Amino acid sequence: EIVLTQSPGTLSLSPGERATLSCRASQSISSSYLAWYQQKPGQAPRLLIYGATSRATGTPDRFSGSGSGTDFTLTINRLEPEDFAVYYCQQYGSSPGYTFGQGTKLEIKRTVAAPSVFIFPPSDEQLKSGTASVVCLLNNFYPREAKVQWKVDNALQSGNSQESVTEQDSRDSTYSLGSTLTLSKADYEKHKVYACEVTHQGLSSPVTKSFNRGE
Amino acid sequence: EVQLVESGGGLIQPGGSLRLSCAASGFIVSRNYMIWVRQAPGKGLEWVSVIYSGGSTFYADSVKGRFTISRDNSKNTLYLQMNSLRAEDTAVYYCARDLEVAGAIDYWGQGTLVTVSSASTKGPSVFPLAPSSGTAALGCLVKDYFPEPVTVSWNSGALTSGVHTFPAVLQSSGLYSLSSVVTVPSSSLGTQTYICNVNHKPSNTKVDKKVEPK
Amino acid sequence: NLCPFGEVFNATRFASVYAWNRKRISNCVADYSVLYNSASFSTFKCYGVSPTKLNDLCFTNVYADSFVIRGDEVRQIAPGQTGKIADYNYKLPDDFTGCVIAWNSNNLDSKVGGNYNYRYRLFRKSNLKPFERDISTEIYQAGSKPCNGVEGFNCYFPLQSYGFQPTNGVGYQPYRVVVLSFELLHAPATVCGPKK
Ligand SMILES: *[C@@H]1O[C@H](CO)[C@@H](O)[C@H](O)[C@H]1NC(C)=O
């Protein structure tokens, strides 16, 4: 069956730059049967281009499609922060009748932004239940790479935390991140100082936020 | 106005059955190429099925014999009957209108999540993340639920600036947990109440939690 | 009195599939040998008859339908098929008796820059009946608003162009198709093979 291979898998470009996304089909298809879609996180795909080159309704002129046979290209001129998304090519001329590429994720660069860090003790309601979740929040940073280290009475904690990162914000192109340290109530009450230390390119030196249990 | 509204997704055990439905407005379902396309979590799009206006139907190899697409002309709606579900069928299912060389897949529904799993439904516990303090941050920890999704709003939708609801993460227990946070002026802590509204439809759980300085 | 298959098979231009051509053949000697001894045909499938014994048979009359489609669609010119061609352009009955002959015509019907003369019906409310020929160009209403003969959102011209260029893959190349149907009523047979 036909396979559509998109490349590159990921792309990081600055506003104003030009993105060039490729789709290579495993066999020659007529250009009337190739389309491109844009999918923003948590939304349905949006049709950009059909018939290799025809702009769908609502597609601005800075999006343009081209190619033929086995190779097709989507070009995005004058990139904007809102262009952050996954882009998919699709063929609809060969069996089984529809095939999508695996997608190219496009990230929009921006100026380095240090995170704002916050630390949250467990609530008393949760403690009453027998568990303690300590939450560390890194807010609106760029780039995505960040190190969060939990320290409990200055002992570096490993194996009991989980991180979650938002998708790039559509307007300011930043990320936020949550790190949760989970403990039983008994373990939580064994210790006093809870701290999360954050390392990031925009920070001159690691930033530590801490609290003392009870205070 | 034209639209495609999907429903019927939810949690089902492997081997089970589910019927998805897609109610159309404007579009006449029986006059269009109508398709189902699915997207497993974190993965790409995979076409599932098509029904022609003349009634012909076609299926992807991976669902053939188990799924059946159909429609009700009087209700103007499209259906996908899914039988013998397996874990690999877990995904968001979109219905969409196809125009082939006249326009490809120009209109998509918003999707409905189907989770095929052995794990039982469990509603979340909601705990405050109290502001400690410029800028203050506060939030809600929504812990130990299954399946996805939960929705979180703040002050019944009136508060959207500075809100970050993070992707759910599966805990080692097999249950989901997520946080929703918001940054606000510290002064507003004395002049504004902050309530997070958590909704977990799979367990019919609706919780409003007021977040106050400890 | 020799049947004019050359008029059909060697016509300079073929019909678009939606407006497929039909030639009634009667009162002549068939001689299918020139067809089934040709190496030029990529497809020669018969239903309810043996090509072998074609030159030793008689029929009330013969129909020769001809048109151009994509390579990938040739499989749809057969009893019991579905798809855009069988459903909306050219439909064979389940009990079809006849032959389907198809050959690659990239050398004649493809043009650098793309030949767009050949079209197929993409939008139709319902399936064609067997041997039905629909040539309407009425704007197709896909939504709830009347089109009033104007193309726009949810109001589509029902015919669409094939884009035949020589460098297309074979499934996208044009194929010329002739369908021979053999008709046996309750009347004298006027089309016989040469040995009859
Ligand atoms: C079409 O023309 C060729 C030219 O070589 C001829 O041999 C062939 O018999 C013709 N087809 C007919 C008469 O059906």
C90: tokens are 């050219």
Contact A28 C163 (CB under 8 A): no
Ligand 1 centroid to Cα of residue C160, in Å, is 32
Q: Residue A65 belongs to a domain with what CATH number?
A: 2.60.40.10
How far, in whole angstroms, is CA A78 from its chain's centroid? 21
Distance CA C82, CA C48 (A): 20
Q: Do B84 and A127 contact (CB within 8 A), yes or no?
A: no
* Atom of ligand 1 at shortest range from CA of C8: 14
CA–CA separation, A176 vs A116, rounded Å? 9
Here the CATH number for the domain that contains residue B22 is: 2.60.40.10
Which residue carries 């699915």 as its tokens? B38
Q: Are residues A69 and A142 in the same domain?
A: no
The first and second tokens of residue C125, run together, are: 């409310």
Residue A169 CA, distance from chain mean position: 9
Token digits of residue B64 = 């053939």
Count of C-beta atoms within a 10 Å radius of residue C177? 25
Single residue among B81, B116, B151 that ends a domain in this structure:
B116
Q: How far apart are CA B47 and CA B80, in angstroms?
A: 13
User: Is the beta carbon of C4 within 6 A of some atom in ligand 1?
Assistant: no
Q: How many interchain CB pairs under 8 A, B with C?
A: 51
* One domain, residues A192 and A143: yes
Q: How was this structure determined?
A: X-ray
Query: Residue C114: CB within 6 Å of ligand 1?
Result: no
Rounded CA gap, B10 and B19, in Å?
A: 10
Chain B CA closest to residue C163: B101
Number of domains in chain B: 2
Of A55, A81, A108, the domain-final residue: A108
Mark out chain A residues that contact chain C at CB-CB < 8 A.
27-32, 57, 68-69, 93-95
Contact A135, A141 (CB under 8 A): no
Is C167–A69 a contact, with Cβ atoms under 8 angstroms apart?
yes
| Residue C31 CA to ligand 1 centre (angstroms) | 12
The CA radius of gyration of chain C, in Å to the nearest whole number, is 18
Does the Cβ of C32 fall within 6 Å of ligand 1?
Answer: no
Phi-psi region of B87 (alpha: psi -120 to 50; beta: other; left: phi over 0): alpha
Q: Which amino acid would we find at residue C145? A: K
Report which residue type is found at B185.
P
Whether residue B129 contacts residue A120, with contact meaning beta carbons closer than 8 Å, is answered with: yes
Task: Find, in chain A, the residue whose alpha carbon is nearest to that of B214.
Answer: A123
Give C172 to chain A, closest Cα distance, Å: 7
Q: What is the DSSP code string of B96-119? A: EEE-GGGTSEEEE---EEEEE-SS
- Closest-CA residue in chain B for A118? B137
User: Is ligand 1 within 6 A of the CB of residue C171?
Assistant: no
Whether residues B99 and B135 share a domain: the answer is: no
User: Is A139 part of the contact surface with chain B (CB cutoff 8 Å)?
Assistant: yes
* CA-closest residue to ligand 1 atom 7: C34
Determine if ligand 1 sits within 6 Å of the CB of residue C12. no
Cβ contact B101–C122 (<8 Å): yes
Considering B83, B116, B149, which residue would you say is the last residue of a domain? B116
Residue-number span of the structural domain to which B78 is assigned: 3-116
Close Cβ partners of B172 (under 8 Å, ≥ 6 residues apart): none
C170, closest residue in chain A (CA to CA): A28
What is the layout of strands, in order, in the sheet containing A207-212? Answer: A155-157, A147-152, A193-199, A207-212
Strand partners, A88: A37
Tally of CB atoms within 10 A around A167? 15
Ligand 1 mutation target, pool C5, C34, C54, C99, most atoms within 8 A of CB: C34
Q: Output the six-digit token pair for B145.
A: 């639920």
* Same domain, yes or no: A124 and A104: no
CA of C22 to the centre of ligand 1 (A): 19
Q: Backbone phi, then psi, for A164, in 5-degree steps? A: -145, 135
**Helix (H) and strand (E) counts for chain B?**
1, 19
Cβ neighbors of C5 (< 8 A, separation 6 or more) are: C31, C34, C35, C64
From the list B61, B103, B104, the residue facing A96 with the nearest CB is: B61
Residue C10 Cβ < 6 Å to ligand 1: yes
Please name the residue whose Cα sits nearest to atom 3 of ligand 1: C10
* Cα(A28)–Cα(A6) distance, integer angstroms: 15
C-alpha distance from C43 to closest chain B C-alpha (Å): 25
Of the residues B60, B88, B116, which one is the last residue of a structural domain? B116
Check whether residue B50 and residue B143 sit in a common domain: no
Would the CB atoms of A30 and C165 count as touching at under 8 Å? yes
Question: Which residues is B148 bridged to in the sheet?
Answer: none
Same domain, A91 and A179: no
Amino acid occupying residue B35? I
Tell me the CB-side half-sphere exposure of residue C183, using CA atoms within 13 A.
Answer: 14
Q: After which residues is chain A broken (C to N over 2.5 A)?
A: none
Q: Give the span between the Cα atoms of C113 and A187, in whole angstroms.
A: 75
The Cα–Cα gap between B111 and B118 comes to 23
The answer to whether residues B96 and B148 belong to one domain is no
Residues B8 and B112 in one domain: yes
Same-domain check for residues A92 and A122: no
Q: Which two tokens stand for residue B25?
A: 């407005």
CB atoms within 10 A of CB C43: 17
Whether residues A8 and A98 share a domain: the answer is yes
User: How far apart are alpha carbons A148 and A158 in whole angstroms?
Assistant: 11
- Cβ neighbours for C74, distance < 8 A, ≥ 6 positions apart: C42, C43, C102, C175, C177
Instruction: Judge if B23 and B70 occupy the same domain.
Output: yes
* Beta strands B205-211; B194-200: pairing state: antiparallel
Residue with tokens 């599932």: B48
Residue B145 and residue B88 in one domain = no
Amino acid at C178: V
* Number of domains observed in the structure of chain A: 2
Of B61, B37, B62, B33, nearest to C84 by C-alpha is B33
DSSP symbol at A142: B
Domain that holds residue A39: 4-108
Measured between alpha carbons, how far is C80 from C96 in angstroms, rounded to an integer? 9
Pocket test for ligand 1, best of C3, C9, C25 (most atoms within 8 A of CB): C9
A84 and A161 share one domain: no
Residues B94, B39 contacting (CB under 8 angstroms): yes
Would you state the structure tokens that stand for residue A202, as one six-digit string?
Answer: 């925009």
What lies within 8 Å, CB to CB, of B161 at 6+ separation is: none
> Letter for the amino acid at B56?
S
Supply C186's token pair.
Answer: 């309750």
Return the number of other C-beta atoms located less than 10 Å from residue A53's C-beta: 15
Using CB atoms, list chains with 3+ pairs below 8 Å to chain C: A, B
Final resolution, Å: 2.0
| Nearest C-alpha neighbor of B214 from the set B130, B101, B158 | B130
Residue A62 CB contacts under 8 Å (≥ 6 apart), including other chains: A76, A77, A78
User: Cα B65 from chain centroid?
Assistant: 26
> Using a CB-CB distance cutoff of 8 angstroms, which residues of chain A are in contact with residue B177?
133, 162, 180
Claim to verify: residue B137 and residue B36 sit in the same structural domain: no
Bridging pattern class, strands B3-7 and B57-59: unpaired
A69 shares a domain with A137: no
